[PDB]
Design a protein around this ligand. Structure first.
Ligand code: 1YD
Lengths: 181, 180
């Protein structure tokens, strides 16, 4: 279920990462010349492509999203793993070749799991079903996060769908728009 | 449940199994060939069917003691450059004395299944849990059936408490798997 994946993304990740995020940003700024200085820059921006096309490297889908650095790692004992490592990446977003914004950015990994699952021989299901699962994942997550008062200021969910009708969509522009709000 | 088994395979086992032996070789160069028996060179994963996943093994069975970590494995993942994958090595005691050593952890998504079972809504309602926990293990053994590519870089230790019996010994069960 998208249900289970949403509960998993909360319980196994956001729940653990959001409370410590700002301390990790303060440290990043101390080490990297106050690079994450704007208020728009102190959130985790999470990409939810409802089509579930999720590359591992962001430059594969948009040339204007450039890797810059990692936040300090977070270590937590988890399910018998001592110091399980939780990591996040800081990117610089270009506009017309100009550094236009800096933020912590990533995809919601479970959507990449739905993609792979939907295509497998036995596990598979239709694209229309995957779309509905992806939408349900976002909806179920948004429901969970209403009991998480901190989430509002530590993360931003960017949900979108790629056009297929000849209309242009720039992922970089969209991320910039959120950073700037 | 099904979803969870596929996630665990797709986002974890599929990625870490093919690099496990290289990290074990490196572990052995670093730590005096500690993972010496063939029994010691597998990822042992614990699946308690009641979904009770403590974060500290020594606390549930004092005969299981943390020793060191495998070398880390870094992978670019969904926008995270160099996401870190991590595993821990434990020694297991018998009659007070070291009796075995292996790579050991719990199946983390059982912790998610449990956390779901209470916070209710959602469905909660065990059946919801024991049911889904069995489906999870079933589905995973089914996925790994196939995949002989590497089944034997890992071993699933699926267990529950005996319904009319005595307390199940985690350490003894772990040793039994290593020894086979
Ligand atoms: N022992 C171990 N297990 C891992 C590791 N990474 C993943 N797993 C296992 O597979 C997870 C599913 O991976 P996925 O990346 O698809 O998960 C999603 C992933 O989208 C997110 N997440 C967890 N850790 C990180 C992370 N460190 N960085 C970014 N996202 C993370 O939330 C995860 C749910 O994690 P989880 O409950 O720990 O569950 C299993 C977890 O049991 C790992 O590094 N070590």
């Amino acid at each position: 279920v998208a249900h289970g994946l949403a509960w998993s993304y909360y319980i196994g990740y956001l729940r653990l990462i959001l409370p410590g995020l700002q301390a990790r940003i303060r440290m990043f700024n101390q080490l990297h010349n106050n690079m994450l200085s704007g208020a728009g820059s102190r959130r985790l921006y999470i990409l939810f492509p409802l089509d579930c096309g999720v590359p591992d490297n962001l430059s594969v889908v948009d040339p204007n999203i450039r890797f810059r650095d990692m936040l300090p790692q977070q270590n937590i004992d988890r399910a018998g793993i001592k110091n399980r490592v939780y990591s996040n990446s800081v990117y610089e977003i270009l506009e017309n070749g100009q550094p236009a914004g800096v933020c912590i950015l990533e995809y919601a990994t479970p959507l990449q799991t739905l993609f792979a699952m939907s295509q497998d021989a036995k596990a598979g299901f239709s694209r229309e079903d995957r779309l509905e699962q992806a939408k349900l994942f976002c909806r179920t997550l948004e429901e969970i996060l209403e009991d998480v008062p901190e989430s509002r200021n530590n993360c931003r969910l960017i949900v979108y769908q790629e056009p297929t009708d000849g209309n242009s969509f720039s992922l970089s522009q969209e991320v910039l728009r959120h950073i700037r709000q």
